[PDB]
């Protein structure tokens, strides 16, 4: 009906505590009368400036502005409107599209991040791929993607090289996953698998599913998509002439690092949890989370059989950088969210500093901490049945969740009583 | 520092919505300025009187009184202080003493509710029992209690009387309970049981334990004591000349109905829950709960093998009334707190209407139901380790409780992994 | 390697307790040695015949048969091989095709149960629908289904009639569900809503989803399918000349009774739980559960505002039978697992006896009991993530389930700590 | 009835797989015929000796012995009887006495472990204290214990010294615990806190309670007692001339380390779980657990504010050894169950190696770990209501426990719904 504002009122003088006059200019333009509680304070925490009061005001713009001007006549502030309030995040699987296509699609992506590649044919490829993923509607499967003989041959080259180095120093869990794929996905030197097949495989495995895209445009919204246990992909490939170094994550990147790790139950869980943090997360909070993701997913360093092995997506997609990180001259601390919260990094050169990991569970634990540690006006949960999020803002929502929780509990109870 | 009041303000005219003048008299005597949000309302729920604004006022008594007078000059009310706020309840086992015997001790009880018995001997007995129960400090065991030959002979008489009709029509669970007692408690025709013995028997059995009580003075505090899984016990006996009908619950009453019922795990827990209702519960809510106890505990009918049986404590303590209730001429509905909420009853003659019970579980269930729909500014839980109450007023308390819950949970989980 | 048998040995004489000779014919043809424990018994349970010993025998068919013959020479039985042990049930959403088409497809169904209709066009419709549903592969969506103007007009007629009687006595929850459909699904008098759209709506609602079916061939496997929260649907319609009475469930049956109820969260859960019980249930147990389904799903009688309302699928798929059941002359007992375990019924005449329902939760409860009461060699659970069944046969499986359980639990914990 | 044996059979030759002859000598003396399954094996695990068959035998001693002799005539072993099988442990708070006094009491302890002390008065003190503690019956309160002025003065001396050095390097949580004592317990320089007072304070804090003991004779049974959250304590004093170094734990030891630590909730629970490990645990397993206790309870190092602080009982009971451990010249690893599983140690001089602790939670975790990987034929749990152990040997016990678990769960649920 009327025009409501949001709390942003920091005057300059300290006298605006009861404001001593301005509650009247609030009410004379139809303010409100709730339970009042704010008096002179800051006794143990001395050195106190003016007090942050939130005199909410919802009337026509003229009256609210005139009364805020009246306050600024005696105070030194006006209640500026439009509180962003953790700007936004979706709630349901389908909604992962419009808010995120409208922010990540119908943008003409130049050939490569390096300005200009003499790959007009690649330009055709990427444009057509985009105009496949662009109009993607959730729930509908993905149309088949052809591949010419050149990306075929390069997939083959990298298949060989990588498989050649796979037993070498890689995560044995990743490696048996890869074997499972090679026998199930359709991983072969000659032929490169589609995404629909492998993604359906993964759905049976973990329920995670791929999604197609051209640009990562919002790591924020990217991490959001992953919160839904849905991974995003770019069905196009590096330049053939760029087989080993990837100037940008491609199929060789994703299909090779990400998925043949993502197959794990609890590791995929952890991956999801990362996104679950990101819901509506602030710009700099988003940056922190994405930064974590950097040192923990694309660039993740496990420890198999007591000795250290590698499990990072990009690492497990890189050929020579793979060897680089494995070598000693790159530094490896251990994983910590805070230590990674502002841990610097570059993008192109062979990254050196790393956060070694020993247990996916431990990663989950530090995530739980930092996320809980991440301030939040709310909380969220993911329902598996609906595949959608569970808004957690009230004791009542918690009750709603734990109801079904206890349901499954007694289910296990009856099951156990039955067994034996 | 200052003098705070509680929200009791209902004017007569409807103009006091913003109070229209009285916020000024609030602030001129040092009111407070927090977030205000309340305006004229009752659009869909039309036909509305004045609005209930909560303008708290914590200044000196003169200032608050003068400003409330200023309001009542234009409004038609004053913010009445001293909110009772669910008057009181304890928190810890030992605390069951001071505030509850300040209200239930040092009251000189005459001989009986009937004015005057010519049983000066019974007067001596009652006085001495009291001056034992009087100075009882929690945790310390109960001193031994002697019993002259007459209450002995009567205990024997009643033992016999019941024992013949005991197996008849009673709750088989209570029956085998008394079996375990007669073989363990010391229940015998000749000798009367002490109370500490059977008390220990219950602590091993269920953790419930006795407490000496002279007067029931507060069913409220009585139900409270129960909430702690502690049942106040009478250390005194009906008149010998009053063997069958007791004008008041005695050792014969409780020793025979209550304890050989309290033997059950879940039924004891249920009893406890009834107490858990009583926490600070309002006077009339207290009356409702006590009423519930009436038709549910001393006077309750079970149903063994599909045929109804007796399980009410007083019933399981009465001899002739016992025959009355099991007979057809008294009415028997089924248990329902709401149906029992204002279900009438007398006390002296043979009670007719009963709320039959199918299973203790059902009782627990509708108890949870009413307790929930029992309005309460809070909630309470019982810590089994410390035997204390668990104040439930914030998500944080719930959190700290469910923490230990999960602890025991994974304890079970590890055990399970171990077993087999 | 060798040929193993299963325990089917019930001799006639009582001597085979230690077998007294036949352990030797077991071993001379390569018997085996676990912990030997079986002797003469049945002391308190006197009147005992021969004892059931399980001397497993895994050798070539000649040796096992010859030794069983040696036993039958002195005993009176042979260890009959190939114990089916509720021979089958699927585990994953995919397998819901192979064993399920192999059990329900490639069977040429005549026009209707009544031998012969003069509806060659209906025969064409049924054949084409089948040869759509026949080749259904899991995960792939359902191709569109056209509808000629006659089923259109009849859908319109029934839409009207039913809508004319919707407020009449129908489940108000179901009814508001239908409102959500009419505003969301595409429920309209003119047009027949497809299955894919409404089923997607349902997945958002409940996660349940449809599956095309022509022949119900196995109610057993039908209930199995629904255990996966997947309802088999018949994309065809009753005879136009048979608008009100349906000799067989059709779209007008299913879309009109089933889904406008199934949309409830907990009721859908309960429905699934039924199937979960049926998971590889035994033939007679299958009959029992299907019988239950009869009186509890298509024909279920709810109770809104304390007065009884209708909520059975077939009921709210029936037009005049719907009026029949609502009337008094058909009997309505209350829902009971056992009373419905063998409650008789016919199929054609307007059914009389009903099992009135007061709360879906109570139906859940009676299920939980009877299911648990249903003996099984094991138990099972449903994972929502993988959408697959969880086999429960060992403490270890219970453990691994409880692990994720506690995971979600601590998720709630951290959320709770965060909120507020 | 008959005489049963236990599985102890390891022949020498490899021929005893089906025993090839000895099943007959078993059955001719009334053997038993259960389901048998074991043949020649060790195909993937080649290089195998004879097979371990469990042919039990319960007939009179003559038959079992003669048939075992017949086996040893052809095999090379006899089924040795009397399997101790984690020899014993109590179950309830009461039984903690007899099976533990019969093993740890009525033993005349000499003056000191060092043979001969000219402390005849100390001998009197120890004798009288024993003849108080020895005949203690569980649940009964503790008679008062006097102390002459000398142990009083030395108590004061150490109170001063330690309190002086308490702020130095100690656990801040422990330190505020000490403050809580000094203000509530009766911990003061001049007068020494009794045991009953502080034990009550602990039942308030945690429910832990002390118990008088002269000799620790069975660390096994000692740790068992602690599993009940009950700590055995020695109500006598070190030699006055031995104030700083104690050749043995005394009140100056226990009152100073143990109780001012146990005040923590989760640390108390952790301590309890340690005892929980000890349930019937084997001799060398007992040694392992006690060894753990050594480096983790009397001698443990915490880490407050990131810098290491002390929290070991004996450490915070030692004065000069206290100064020793905190200093650098002794080694301090971190707490690791396995690294502490067989970590060597001495007793008398100033111990060097230490297993530093970051959080009590960490200890809880590694305890859960080792306990799990501690083999046990079963599991156990502790009921708070009954204060007694919960046997875990079958799913059904798990069931009945998790039942109450879910009970408390929905208790929290109803509370949650109520709150707000
Ligand atoms: Fe990537
Ligand atoms: Fe009573
Ligand atoms: Fe149907
Ligand atoms: Fe000690």
């Amino acid at each position: 009906g009327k025009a409501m504002l949001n709390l942003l009122f920091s005057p300059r003088a300290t006298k605006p505590s009861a404001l001593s006059r301005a509650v009247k200019v609030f009410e004379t333009f139809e303010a409100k009368i709730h339970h009042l509680e704010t008096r002179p304070a800051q006794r143990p925490r001395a050195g106190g400036p003016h007090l942050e009061y939130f005199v909410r005001l919802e009337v026509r713009r003229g009256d609210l502005a005139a009364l805020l001007s009246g306050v600024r006549q005696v105070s030194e502030d006006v209640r500026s409107p439009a509180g962003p309030k953790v700007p936004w995040f979706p709630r349901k699987v389908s909604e992962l599209d419009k808010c995120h296509h409208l922010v990540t699609k119908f943008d003409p992506d130049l050939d490569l991040d390096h300005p200009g590649f003499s790959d007009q044919v690649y330009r055709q490829r990427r444009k057509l791929i985009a105009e496949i993923a662009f109009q993607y509607r959730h729930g509908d499967p993905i149309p088949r993607v052809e591949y010419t003989a050149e990306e075929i041959a390069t997939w083959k080259e990298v298949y060989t090289t990588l498989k050649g180095l796979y037993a070498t120093h890689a995560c044995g869990e990743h490696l048996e996953a890869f074997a499972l794929l090679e026998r199930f996905s359709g991983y072969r030197e000659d032929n490169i698998p589609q995404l629909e097949d492998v993604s359906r495989f993964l759905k049976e495995r973990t329920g995670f599913q791929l999604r197609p895209v051209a640009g990562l445009l919002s790591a924020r919204d990217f991490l959001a998509s992953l919160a839904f246990r849905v991974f995003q992909c770019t069905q196009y490939i590096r330049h053939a002439s760029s087989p080993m170094h990837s100037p940008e994550p491609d199929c060789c990147h994703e299909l090779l690092g990400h998925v043949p790790m993502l197959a794990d139950r609890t590791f995929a869980q952890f991956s999801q949890d990362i996104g679950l943090a990101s819901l509506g997360a602030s710009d700099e909070e988003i940056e922190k989370l994405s930064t974590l993701y950097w040192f923990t997913v694309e660039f993740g360093l496990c420890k198999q059989n007591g000795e250290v092995k590698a499990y990072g997506a990009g690492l497990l997609s890189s050929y020579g950088e793979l060897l680089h990180c494995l070598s000693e001259e790159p530094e490896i601390r251990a994983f910590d969210p805070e230590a990674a919260a502002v841990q610097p990094y570059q993008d192109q050169t062979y990254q050196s500093v790393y956060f070694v990991s020993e247990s996916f569970s431990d990663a989950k634990d530090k995530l739980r901490s930092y996320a809980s540690r991440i301030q939040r006006p709310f909380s969220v949960k993911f329902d598996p049945y609906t595949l959608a999020i569970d808004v957690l803002d009230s004791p009542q929502a918690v009750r709603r969740s734990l109801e079904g929780v206890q349901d499954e509990l007694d289910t296990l109870a009856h099951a156990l009583s039955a067994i034996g």
Side-chain angles (χ1 to χ4, degrees), chain A residues 19-205:
Chain A
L19 294 86
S20 299
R21 193 252 167 288
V23 284
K24 188 233 173 192
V25 312
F26 267 102
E27 55 91 9
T28 44
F29 283 161
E30 302 92 27
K32 329 182 192 287
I33 309 287
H34 215 190
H35 174 226
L36 285 301
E37 180 190 292
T38 292
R39 277 189 186 176
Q42 295 162 316
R43 316 176 65 88
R45 313 174 178 102
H50 49 77
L51 321 184
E52 293 289 327
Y53 41 77
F54 166 43
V55 189
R56 172 156 268 168
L57 63 159
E58 186 209 345
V59 291
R60 316 306 176 189
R61 181 65 62 186
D63 275 8
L64 65 91
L67 71 88
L68 288 187
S69 71
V71 190
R72 209 176 180 179
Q73 285 154 13
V74 60
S75 159
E76 310 79 41
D77 198 286
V78 294
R79 195 64 50 82
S80 44
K85 306 180 275 209
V86 303
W88 151 265
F89 60 87
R91 300 299 327 281
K92 279 76 63 180
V93 301
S94 44
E95 292 79 330
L96 274 302
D97 316 349
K98 57 148 171 296
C99 169
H100 319 75
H101 286 74
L102 266 63
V103 77
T104 56
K105 313 312 182 313
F106 47 86
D107 51 319
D109 298 357
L110 76 163
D111 50 4
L112 278 81
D113 271 338
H114 162 83
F117 263 59
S118 279
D119 296 281
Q120 177 75 346
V121 306
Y122 294 4
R123 275 181 279 281
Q124 316 325 289
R125 302 291 294 252
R126 318 324 167 84
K127 282 308 181 180
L128 59 88
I129 287 152
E131 66 205 279
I132 313 306
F134 170 91
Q135 70 286 22
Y136 160 74
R137 304 290 84 76
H138 164 71
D140 175 72
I142 304 314
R144 296 318 205 94
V145 184
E146 51 82 20
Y147 301 103
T148 44
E150 59 276 17
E151 66 275 43
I152 286 169
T154 57
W155 158 264
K156 187 156 202 168
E157 184 175 2
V158 305
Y159 201 104
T160 57
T161 56
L162 272 295
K163 185 163 192 47
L165 292 185
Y166 278 169
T168 81
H169 320 93
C171 177
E173 205 284 335
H174 175 81
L175 292 169
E176 49 84 12
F178 148 72
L180 267 44
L181 319 186
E182 197 158 48
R183 71 169 34 76
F184 295 145
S185 70
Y187 281 169
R188 41 184 163 284
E189 298 71 4
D190 52 355
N191 199 350
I192 174 170
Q194 277 295 326
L195 80 164
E196 302 94 348
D197 44 0
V198 293
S199 45
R200 179 173 283 177
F201 160 85
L202 163 76
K203 290 146 33 173
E204 293 105 23
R205 272 300 196 288

Side-chain angles (χ1 to χ4, degrees), chain A residues 222 231 249 253-254 258 293 297-298 313-314:
Chain A
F222 145 77
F231 189 77
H253 150 81
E254 47 205 10
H258 283 276
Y293 166 88
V297 175
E298 306 297 355

